[PDB]
Amino acid sequence: TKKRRNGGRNKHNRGHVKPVRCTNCARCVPKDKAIKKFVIRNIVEAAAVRDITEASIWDSYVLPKLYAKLHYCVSCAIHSKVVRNRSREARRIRTPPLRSFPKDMAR
């Protein structure tokens, strides 16, 4: 049976939409059927940051951030546990939650 009203995602008024490549897997999965992670990361862990701001000649030199987007195969995002096996009533929730912590995945 039809497990989702979305199916993948967002395939309405398109017919067929472009694919991207997975990161860990290097698949060719649709752009919309894709776990996407716009990952912002500090370059220097923010725990070895005091070693680096010692060597900063300038005004302690506020650190640049790393920017990427993690297009994921579905079978290779469950495997890396970005997403997991929700309950059938928890399946329906999309926007909640942010609601966790300060800045995650950095650490």
Partner: protein, 220 residues
């Protein structure tokens, strides 16, 4: 028939790079070149050096807040142990360009070409964004895709009035003020309220002539 013996840095002479009469300070840093010979002249193993340097490191803000604006210099002439390093472009740092792209807004580009009174045929990259006027709880503030082509029209005519503008001694002084970015902003807000405008890239794909008669008032 060379067979260099040990420590090839021993035959390497240090050369400190310089800067023109453009804005400010002269010496920037040092590079190191081999010793002169009849086959390997040190003066011509050295004019293919492009030197990468920021602007706030050279406008001498002790608190560098313009530190997102690299602009390269091409080593061009060897004189008095210190190479001269004429202009080669105006880039912009990676983590300033990549840090402004958060979705929910409109990226407008203008990749434009014009050349000055002297034939430095340079290519300018006017990059802007759209800004959510507050009191709007909508999350997008996206343009109208003919609103885009109307300001992209407007960004290409003013900067091709600026570039044909009495060659770089005026022109790099404009982007050292970002004086186009304060007039590419107030003009286009009759069309759309625009966000941070970053000129983001300049290639200098053509260079007219070497001819140091035009370099002595530019370096001296």
């Amino acid at each position: 028939g060379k067979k260099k013996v040990v420590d090839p840095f021993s035959r390497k002479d240090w050369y400190d790079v310089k800067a023109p009469n453009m804005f400010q300070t002269r010496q920037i840093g040092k590079t190191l070149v081999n010793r002169t010979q009849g086959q390997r002249i040190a003066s011509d193993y050295l004019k293919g050096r492009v030197f990468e340097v920021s602007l706030a490191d050279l406008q001498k803000d002790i608190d560098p807040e313009r530190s997102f604006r690299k602009f390269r210099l091409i080593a061009e002439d060897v004189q008095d142990r210190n190479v001269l390093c004429n202009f080669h472009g105006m880039d912009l740092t990676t983590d300033k360009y990549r840090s402004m792209v958060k979705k929910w807004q409109t990226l407008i580009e203008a990749i434009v070409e014009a050349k000055t009174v002297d034939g430095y045929l340079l290519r300018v990259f006017c990059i802007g964004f759209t800004a959510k006027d507050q009191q709007s709880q909508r999350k997008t503030c996206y343009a109208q895709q003919s609103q885009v082509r109307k300001i992209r029209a407007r960004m290409t005519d003013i900067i091709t009035n600026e570039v044909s503008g009495a060659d770089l001694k005026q022109l790099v002084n404009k982007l050292a003020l970002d004086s186009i970015a304060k007039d590419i902003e107030k003009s286009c807000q009759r069309i759309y309220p625009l966000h941070d405008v970053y000129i983001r890239k300049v290639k200098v794909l053509k260079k007219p002539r070497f001819d140091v008669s035009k370099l002595l008032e530019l370096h001296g």
